[PDB]
Design a protein around this ligand. Structure first.
Ligand SMILES: [Mg+2]
Ligand SMILES: [Mg+2]
Ligand SMILES: [Mg+2]
Ligand SMILES: [Mg+2]
Ligand SMILES: [Mg+2]
Ligand SMILES: [Mg+2]
Ligand SMILES: [Mg+2]
Ligand SMILES: [Mg+2]
Lengths: 427, 428, 428, 427
């Protein structure tokens, strides 16, 4: 037939696992032959998933740390890279609130269709590709890498291990670079800073992490796998079967049949250590922005897994000035990086930037009409010194690029967009 | 027997409504009431939000000094606009093309995206307003009397022929649109009004479009507001010279494609506006500058033949406002326009610029000072609570308390509610 | 500012519950005031959900029984109604296999996105509507009701109570007439005739049926709620918390923490008795198609609730010529109806009809090329005297209907479809 | 700062056009530098679009003729390959009637959303991949290539060249092997065998074919481009600007501004010769299944382009036994293959198979209930001799394959699907 997409042999995969330092501390409870048996006759190449994953892994070891902001539209991701950020965080919370495939506004409880986050991954890459295409024809070299890696939210898997497997597969097809997975009961998933959280036994989350790795292996991409634990605040567990969880089981039971468990940094350390061999980065949800507790978690984990990188949630669910002074806020991220928190991200940055900017505009617009918008347009003009370009909105969305396509197909076409527009004649 | 739910009206009932309801006092239909019924089948679905929105919109356009709106490309965007006191929502096709269409790609405004993209955003905006209305009910919030603000959505050029026009209107009505606007451009060469290289369609062809949009609203039995837009002020090309109303502006020369070169300006806009009036609840003239004098010329000339005709005006971000106008004129702009008959006024790309600038300003500061940049935003949100802002408590803004209410309604003793013990409960 | 979609008061709802015989045997653990508190300021009308639910409830008490076939495309439902069936069944198995929003082929384990089945409900209603429209312009009264009630698969709700609520809401928005919900763990969901099934406690499914009724009440439509139990084959359960399930707990455990339980018709009778106050119909999956086993379940349930209607799956997963003789197969549904099984359905009928007919045609096409297809078309021609109409495929999908729209907008259009078509000149 | 997805140089592309025999008779009015200019920094790999396009082109030259059937669902395509067919045809007609993203039933008039056919391409490929995966774990080698190439319907492009460009790009992203494009006015597009067809000028369709090729080159895949002409029955054209069309323009006009034109085989031959340098296959819609009329079209085109391959629509819109005897019906495809019609397809085969088979069952079901179904189940049993496998429906949709994924993740899983089922016990 054709040699396109021929699967590699179990020997090559074993070779790659043995020699490539990317897999230096990755445990696999399945064999390389098990991967081959699940790949059929053709293995689709996932370019953006591979490139982003390799770029992400590289940046986590080159840069002091990799920091990101939550993005829920393609334009958001474009502006984050344009501004200098090297990675995009794809928040599930935000998807639930304003960008999921049901069309409804949801709280962060795994209510939306399971393929919603993959579509936002694809959408973001599409927008970054368009920005990359525009920069090439415009000769704009302000950004070295427009295809910045995407770290996406796997939540609690939307079911069992097969649901996990299919979500990770869908995230890779969309071109994700990393995905994170939490140890909550899928049917009761909550945001890390909401209540009513229900843990699942330690082994079950290792099962989830193993499933996430397996799909990345079957698709043949070094996807960064992130493990999140919600044990600092969760006081409910589904079962006491796992002996690793028993020291925190109180015996008390709820009407639903859940077991009460003792929460805090100790069960997070215990679970972190158990997840480490199956996680490229570890992440513990916390109740406050507190450097001491972060250092404490960092020390206990690195005392057994010294090279284990960590991720920290700089959550807008914290009232930041209520806990930290301005000076502590200024060094918060830099001090975290010294502890090994190499991926840091403001999860709901997109939500609050979108909701506040439109309220501020609409409120002024209701009182003073055009005066309020001219205020915004002038800030846009003033920001052009800093590299802002979306003021010329026609080229920002690719008017020049499609004019180039149109002239490539027909050099004498008289229906090009940017020639004659008010943009070229007023900006 | 058989269920009578959704039994269609008779032809005589429709004719009585057309004859006596003042909504249709100036609406011309070249088809009959029996034609409408003939297309409705055995069951006519109710479109609650499209009906409510259309009625509220029409009432507001006659009761308020003028209705104004801002472009919205996400559900949360519309929530804040209504929360801030706005009484209508404009759904830009430009914004949908650039950051919210079903292809997943970023497109310029050239009718490149799938034809059902805007309807999806109509349904999304309504869903988001319904969630804010639900939350408001359980929170005792009465700061907004009508959360379900009318939506005016961009129908562009119909994505093809009359049948493409019809299905787009039907899909917008099914999603709950209050009004839709249609422009006299060649769909295969559609452009934003302030882009170059526009190709007009013949006047009679856009009367076909407006007639098809009205027909789709009638078959669906909702009084959708039909808005006619003309791009004749800047377009120098037209597909054909077949319409005698267009011929006086044609020069005679043709392009290699076969298009006819035509003379643009306000004069062909007035002519097309007069021809569209019997089929348009609102008329909209795309212009190259924000000019009150030019707006008055178009208004007086149109109202001379149809004095009750309402107009619409695009306060376009494509205009460099302070380059053309002083601050005093900017402050009175919409007010002066309202006196001329421009009763619906909108900023098309308000959402694109608010979204792109806010995220850039945050990411720029975040790239240099990390958390110090975000705390500034959070502190601004805290400060905006005096003006009525609420999204700082993001958990309840998206309905965590509402779904907690659903959960406890099913199981009052559930121990897995979301807001209970949340960091929002204890820190905000 | 309008009164469209104004919610009813709690007293009005409570009065409907107290007097409308539709709710005669319906237990609601929540209050009428709870329903109102969740409805915001506007309640959208769900015309097809209301009509379908009403028609369904009417047919279950007026006809000897209501039989259906699984359909996964719009055209399938059209042909089912065309051939004389009064109800459509929407299999979740079939959606997982060949019609879900992931684009992938899935076994029946709740792997596809949760809004997949609603989309097919909307699709089926859309296709039935088109046939209804086509029949009107064609003067075809051979079918009384093209909008046959749809009974859709809710699986295990795709999570907790709130996931159940949203699926029911979406099914209603899409126009479903009824939905069935099973007492399996959504995380490890399986087809009823698959292995490794894990039950949830009796009370957790009572909570599911409650959330399902609540979503219908908030939507103000009398959706037929069906309760399904898988305890006939399942040897696992998630917890021993419910004392109604404890008499079957063996005391063993699994590595995952599941509890071994004793399967059989006995725990199905018990769970059905518990589910009865919360189900318009009750259904137990069974390992074989057996009339006596069905009579045992029937008479046992009706011993406590003699007016409880039941549902039965004549599963394709069975092997009928193996078990039963021809004469028993003929009387099978008729005898099941006399026992109270008033809704019967063949789940995977669409899957098998689609896969076999395409294999049969593709195989013949491989050997004999055009000779194979001509056998089908002549078989299609022959079926016209039984009512079949899809041989003329252009009119079947609405070519004439859209000609009517096109001629209504522009009666002089020179670009209509059926005039000059090969269908017009070659199909008499 | 990675190498994955690096675009190749213009001279590297120019070398493929000059040497690869795939492009021996392909005219490109744009340059290799033009292609590189539109590719940005990264070029995604479209494995299935590449593999399928290479397989299809190879089959067209190696087989007597490649024939296919219309498929509108994933399971349909699975059964077509299972029965021995080596290609899938994706009818736009069928998509409009029962599988487009609007949810509505439509006549064949370009009414549905433009990304609908790409979705079905991706869906068909997903189904074929699932059958490929199941076949691997079951040791099934009765099918050599489950990834049969897909020929998809691009209709009239849903607008201008930029619309054409985006449809071809989305089809390629979905894994298409070929796409066909017709010379109709998009806003008035009709099925070839419906009335009221309006042609666009010859040059405008060359513009379409060029745009379709450009998108395939920018995607770096050898997509098979097929040119369809509707001039046999269409008596309308939009303009008289192209002098190649004027010898058929009569001077008559319609109220809309169209031009009456003389339909027939003559303008089909002329337009075909104009499309030949821009089309890998050429396709003339006809009003009857006539072998003599096909020869005239074939020998006329091949007089100027000897190696020009042709495609023929064996349309269900023909009443076959009203025109042909059984002897001619049997040899129809074979005769066409000898004239150079190397891609032959029954467009609406899926619609009629699905609609008839369900009416036949539902009718008998409404009359004799279970007896009607057991007849179908018995015919499915008897079909196992011929290779039919969907009778065991659980494994048919991958229950066994996902059981493998489950046991690969956790060997001791108590929640496997096929063990203890009625499939392993009654089949
Ligand atoms: Mg999350
Ligand atoms: Mg590790
Ligand atoms: Mg627009
Ligand atoms: Mg008027
Ligand atoms: Mg099911
Ligand atoms: Mg009951
Ligand atoms: Mg087609
Ligand atoms: Mg050629």
């Amino acid at each position: 037939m054709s040699v396109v997409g021929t699967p590699k042999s179990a020997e090559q995969i074993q070779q790659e696992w043995d020699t490539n330092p990317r897999w230096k501390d990755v445990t696999r409870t399945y064999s390389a032959e098990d991967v081959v048996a699940l790949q059929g006759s053709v293995v689709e190449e996932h370019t953006l998933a591979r490139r982003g994953a390799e770029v992400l892994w590289e940046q986590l070891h080159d840069l002091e740390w990799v920091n990101a902001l939550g993005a829920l539209t393609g334009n958001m991701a474009v502006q984050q890279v344009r501004a200098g950020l090297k990675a995009i965080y794809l928040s599930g919370w935000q998807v639930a609130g304003d960008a999921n495939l049901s069309g409804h506004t949801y709280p962060d409880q795994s209510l939306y269709p399971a393929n919603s986050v993959p579509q936002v991954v694809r959408r973001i890459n599409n927008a970054l590709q368009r920005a990359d295409q525009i920069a090439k024809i415009e000769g704009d070299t302000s950004v070295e890498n427009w295809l910045a890696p995407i770290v996406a939210d796997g939540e609690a898997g939307f079911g069992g291990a097969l649901n996990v497997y299919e979500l990770q597969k869908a995230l890779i097809a969309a071109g994700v670079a990393g995905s994170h997975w939490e140890d909550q009961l899928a049917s009761e998933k909550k945001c890390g800073h909401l209540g009513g959280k229900v843990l699942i036994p330690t082994q079950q989350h290792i099962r989830t992490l193993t499933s996430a790795r397996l799909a990345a292996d079957v698709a043949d991409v070094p996807t960064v796998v992130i493990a999140r634990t919600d044990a600092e605040a969760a006081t409910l567990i589904t079962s006491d079967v796992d002996e690793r969880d028993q020291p925190f089981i109180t015996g008390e039971r709820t009407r639903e049949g859940f077991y009460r468990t003792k929460n805090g940094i100790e069960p997070c350390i215990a679970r972190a250590k158990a997840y480490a061999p199956f996680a490229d980065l570890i992440w513990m949800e916390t109740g406050t922005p507190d450097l001491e507790a972060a250092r404490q978690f960092s020390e206990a984990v690195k005392a057994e897994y010294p090279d284990q990188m960590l991720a920290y949630n700089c959550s807008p669910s914290f009232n930041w000035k209520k806990h930290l002074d301005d000076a502590t806020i200024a060094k918060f991220q830099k001090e975290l990086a010294a502890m090994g928190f190499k991926f840091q991200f403001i999860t709901l940055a997109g939500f609050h930037a979108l909701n506040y900017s439109m309220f501020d505009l609409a409120y002024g617009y209701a009182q003073n009409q055009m005066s309020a918008y001219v205020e915004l347009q002038e800030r846009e003009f003033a920001a052009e010194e800093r590299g802002y370009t979306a003021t010329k909105h026609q080229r920002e969305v690719g008017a020049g690029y499609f004019d180039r396509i149109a002239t490539t197909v027909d050099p004498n076409s008289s229906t090009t967009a940017l020639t004659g527009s008010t943009e070229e004649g007023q900006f």
